[PDB]
Amino acid sequence: PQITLWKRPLVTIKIGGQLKEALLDTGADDTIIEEMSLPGRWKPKMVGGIGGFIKVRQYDQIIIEIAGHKAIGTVLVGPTPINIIGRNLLTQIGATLNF
Amino acid sequence: PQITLWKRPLVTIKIGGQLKEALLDTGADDTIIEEMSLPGRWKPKMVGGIGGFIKVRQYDQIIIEIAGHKAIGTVLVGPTPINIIGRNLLTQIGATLNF
Numbered sequence A, B: 001p002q003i004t005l006w007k008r009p010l011v012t013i014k015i016g017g018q019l020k021e022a023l024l025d026t027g028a029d030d031t032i033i034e035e036m037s038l039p040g041r042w043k044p045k046m047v048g049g050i051g052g053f054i055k056v057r058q059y060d061q062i063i064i065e066i067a068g069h070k071a072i073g074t075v076l077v078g079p080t081p082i083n084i085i086g087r088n089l090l091t092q093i094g095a096t097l098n099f
């Protein structure tokens, strides 16, 4: 698709059997969601934002569908105020910013 | 242009007559710039992101050139670690996400 930005660019995502949605965020290096069901063991990691730094749970090799495109990569679980798809996965679905 | 997302999508901006650079951020509702002087009366606001809230000054109807394209709109000024162009100005230059 070609998505305009008059509202937040939210898309469906699917991980395992869970359908969620998330914000396509070109300002995010990393993908972060609030919860992922039965994800297994994780590794601690720190991530920084506008307000300071947060501890997250890092899961690698996650298979995720984004807007009907398959991606595989690192998904962080942490106290983000909204699920975000960051550039580590946006590149895999071939998203670009255009103007 | 078409911007791929293998690195942060930073572009040149011009604001207050000064050349700066800023992140094109589809995940940001509003534009936030580091400390600088702007014209007009401002209003106090708070903005929330990862890791918490920050206090900003809101200035309205500010001209900003974004990679050669003129935009006019709301600009928040405050202790962000990076200049961010949010959707409020991305929409004025017709920026879209494509995949």
Ligand SMILES: CC(C)CN(C[C@@H](O)[C@@H](Cc1ccccc1)NC(=O)O[C@H]1CO[C@H]2OCC[C@H]21)S(=O)(=O)c1ccc(N)cc1
Binding pocket: B035, B043, B044, B045, B046, B055, B056, B057, B077, B078, B079
């Ligand atoms: C964009 C910033 C300037 C915002 N200011 C916030 C303020 O806490 C900081 C913002 C600040 C601080 C330093 C450098 C840049 C910005 N301090 C400041 O302006 O200086 C005063 C604080 O102690 C002293 O330092 C010099 C005189 C005093 S503010 O206009 O007073 C304001 C306060 C509350 C909200 N919600 C929104 C804005």
Ligand SMILES: CC(C)CN(C[C@@H](O)[C@H](Cc1ccccc1)NC(=O)O[C@H]1CO[C@H]2OCC[C@H]21)S(=O)(=O)c1ccc(N)cc1
Binding pocket: A025, A026, A027, A028, A029, A030, A031, A032, A047, A048, A049, A050, A051, A081, A082, A084, A086, B025, B026, B027, B028, B029, B030, B031, B032, B047, B048, B049, B050, B081, B082, B084, B086
């Ligand atoms: C978290 C999003 C819902 C909102 N944020 C925009 C987002 O693009 C920020 C924009 C950003 C970018 C750099 C530093 C601070 C904020 N990126 C971010 O927090 O990414 C974090 C996860 O990946 C990491 O890569 C960047 C830091 C990590 S935000 O900066 O807090 C913000 C919130 C409201 C407005 N008006 C403007 C910006």
